[PDB]
């Protein structure tokens, strides 16, 4: 119980040095959708050796955006230059995991081909008094009327899935992992509070798993099994993504991608599980256990509770985010109980290549 997350960890094929993981966290200096030198220069910042980095959610097809300027590895182009990011990683010896990301009802024609309707499980919008989804000249509109897909049309999404799986690897990524939480397009699949299907896709916990299921066996079969993370947060009601009861719909997750794992064989890369985030920490055990492989947590987490999560054996591997955001070097810093750098929302989802993006420094040396 003594370990920490500076215990190093085998991740399957990759040792891992400590239990830091950079959260996938898209920032939006991807202009155009194509990776460049400033992603470069951001992952690379921080990457540590033995160090996992999970790459800001990234679009797996035209249209599976609902920010500005996220990258994209579905096409050659978008792949070219993500090889520049992987290497400024592996040559500091990290790893680093394409998010597959699909954000379904939550973009705006702004994002689609053709300005035309996103695609979703369901026709309903998120709701907009809640959220809005932010356009690339910075405002905020509602999400539209997405357009349900049908039932025959989903197996293709699947080899969106699948090609930039297939492509990230291709750019040299260490792997893939599965966003599927988030209220993005798998998640609207599988939460009842989305979901308002009836067909082949909806209902039943297992039918909202269906989706999910195709997916990671899609590109599983196209990459391997321990090439593959799955996040997912189902107890997190982000655009509209609540379920009547998340841990009963993470066990049917889980219980997926441990049968996935039996007969593939195979253990997968890890799960994924943003804390539903007194009681703020009581259900991730659950996932935690239930499922048959590392488990990383995320949501809310400082040095403190990533220790407790590893030392009290809480939960394997663990990632973080804001605190990755303006602490480059946030495993030294936390390895040594340093300063750490406070970030800024205002930046967060801005353009600039550098003011807010590589400017958070590295503690003095
Ligand atoms: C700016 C920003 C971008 C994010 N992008 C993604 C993303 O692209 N994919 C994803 O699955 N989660 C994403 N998240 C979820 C966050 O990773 C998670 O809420 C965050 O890491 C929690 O950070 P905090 O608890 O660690 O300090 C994003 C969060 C932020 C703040």
Not at 61 to 90: C, L, M, N, R, T
Not at 313 to 324: E, P, Q, T
């Amino acid at each position: 119980s003594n370990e920490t997350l500076f215990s190093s960890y085998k991740m399957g094929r990759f040792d891992l040095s400590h239990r830091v993981v950079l959260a996938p966290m898209t920032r939006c200096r991807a202009l155009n959708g194509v990776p460049n030198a400033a992603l470069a220069e951001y992952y690379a910042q921080r990457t540590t050796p033995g160090g996992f980095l999970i790459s800001e959610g990234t679009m797996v097809s035209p249209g599976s955006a609902g920010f500005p300027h996220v990258p994209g590895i579905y096409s050659d182009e978008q792949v070219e230059a993500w090889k520049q990011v992987v290497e400024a990683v592996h040559a500091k010896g990290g790893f680093i995991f394409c998010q597959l990301w699909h954000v379904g009802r939550a973009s705006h024609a702004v994002y689609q081909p053709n300005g035309g309707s996103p695609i979703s499980s369901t026709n309903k919008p998120i709701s907009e008094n809640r959220w809005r989804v932010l356009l690339p000249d910075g405002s905020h509109v509602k999400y539209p009327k997405p357009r349900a897909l049908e039932a025959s049309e989903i197996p293709r999404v699947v080899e969106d899935y699948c090609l930039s799986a297939l492509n990230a690897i291709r750019a040299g990524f260490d792997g893939i992992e599965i966003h599927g939480a988030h209220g993005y397009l798998i998640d609207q699949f599988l939460k009842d509070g989305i979901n308002d299907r009836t067909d082949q896709y909806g209902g039943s916990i297992a039918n909202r798993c269906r989706f999910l299921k195709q997916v990671v066996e899609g590109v599983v079969s196209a990459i391997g099994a321990s090439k593959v993370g799955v996040r997912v947060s189902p107890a997190i009601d982000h655009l509209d993504a609540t379920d009547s009861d998340p841990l009963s719909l993470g066990l049917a997750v889980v219980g997926m991608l441990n049968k996935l794992q039996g007969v593939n064989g195979s253990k997968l890369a890890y799960l994924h599980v943003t804390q539903p985030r007194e009681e703020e920490a009581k259900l991730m055990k659950s996932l935690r256990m239930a499922y048959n492989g590392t488990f990383m947590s995320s949501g809310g987490f400082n040095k403190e509770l990533g220790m407790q999560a590893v030392q009290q054996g809480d939960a394997d591997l663990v990632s973080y985010g804001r605190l990755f955001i303006a602490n480059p070097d946030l495993v030294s810093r936390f390895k040594i109980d340093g300063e750490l750098n406070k970030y800024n929302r205002k930046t967060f989802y801005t353009q600039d290549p550098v003011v807010g993006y590589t400017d958070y420094p590295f503690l003095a040396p």
